[model samples]
Target: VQGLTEEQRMMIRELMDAQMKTFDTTFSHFKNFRLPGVAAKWSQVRKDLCSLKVSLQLRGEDGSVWNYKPPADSGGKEIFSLLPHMADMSTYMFKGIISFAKVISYFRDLPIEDQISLLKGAAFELCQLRFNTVFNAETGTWECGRLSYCLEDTFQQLLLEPMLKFHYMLKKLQLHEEEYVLMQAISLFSPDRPGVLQHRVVDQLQEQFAITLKSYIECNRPQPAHRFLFLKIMAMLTELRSINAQHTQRLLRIQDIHPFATPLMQELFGITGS
Candidate 1:
């Protein structure tokens, strides 16, 4: 109806159908712990648990003895402290991404070099996607671990403000959970990263999700601005990559200040500059 060739229309239709299925399947796994606004819930829980007891009890020949105990109010002071809990969060986030084995297998299917390239290039965008899950859109803040900070404040703390404006716009748009899931999938499936050995394969997969998103807007949204919404979302991905680079640099600069210098942290956050 839009004067697209028969082949083009069919291609778009197929891509959208496949993506719709993929989005549903991928989002199912994340439903339990990765729901929208769940980030704050987890942060609160983490803060609560930390605040409750920082003491360890051990059994000795005599009896139970407390080896180490911090003052009761110390948890509040450690809000931004980069140590034990921060490393725990890193582990959780890294495992959370890999939990999508079905999707990640696509990367594993690629050549080893391509796999490395995609992981390094897209890690921060993936982080942003996960970050948004628990983000409080109205307040313009993100909670990762026990700390919640405004986007503006993050920049001041030498933390990267990757996707700050983009996230603000996203909040304004009121994107649906399904859309967020699709956007994450889009980030993970990117093929245009510099050093990908199988760029064509990556492009084909990315385009499939893109077409799926376009079809979602056309049929589901059915508004005059549907196309505009799709384009804006797609365009902002470029900004995400730039922000990720900034974040990588920040991670490198602060490597020595905290316990986040572990190999897993470096690999997951693309902090290695590798």
Candidate 2:
């Protein structure tokens, strides 16, 4: 009782706030799973998302990723060449890291071939779902660290219109961070991904994820008007599926013009290197 007073507490906290402004990690906000299997699967998904939801930039030894900016006056070819170098492209590898470590680890027991197939199909789309974290609805720009990309940014000319619409629609949903994790997981378990010959296991996993998301929306969003929110969210994922395929279609043309894409980018787009 004799150790401190209101004024002293404020003085100490102010000093600490100025000096200790950064942190490293966090944990899942959810608790109490319905069963060991449910806890085993979705809880693990939430834990990894805790780590990934923290940052959205590419780290390089030279620090160029932090200082990058789109050139305002460049020829279309030069701009396209530079697009592959920007931090926006970092989403390609960033989603892969999360998948390798935790997102896809849930599928560790699946046929090894099927596992790789799932990651390849979901990698780009998962990150697009994650992109909502930094999308500024008011400004219509993705606030990726020190830079921002607006719709007219034109890095991927074909997708700019659709991508912009998707961003605004998703931002309007006001989904919880946990909702995004489940959304990405739902997409990651698609049974029809081209190389997935063994559909039974992947198909069941997708069904489980869908039910969890549905029951979750019910438990959490108890308002009567929220009845159809779940349907709208699933439709957004369908929209992402369309964007996902269109993204690969556009990349095919870029590969002809720009050959030296990062190996990671090529792999995510399913382009075997030239």
Best prediction by lDDT: 2
Q: Write the per-residue lDDT of candidate 1 for residues 161-186, one digit (tens) a residue.
A: 33556566566666766566557667
Model 2, 170-251: lDDT tens per residue?
9888887556766776787899988997798888877766766676677678677677888999999999999889766655
Q: How many residue pairs in model 2 have overlapping backbones? A: 0
lDDT of model number 1: 0.55
* lDDT score of residue 149 within candidate 1: 40
Model 1 per-residue lDDT at 250:
55
Model 2, runs deviating above 4 Å: 1-76, 91-105, 151-160
Q: Pick out the ten consecutive residues of candidate 2 with the lowest summed lDDT.
A: 22-31
RMSD of 1: 10.9
What is the TM-score (0 to 1) of candidate 1? Answer: 0.60
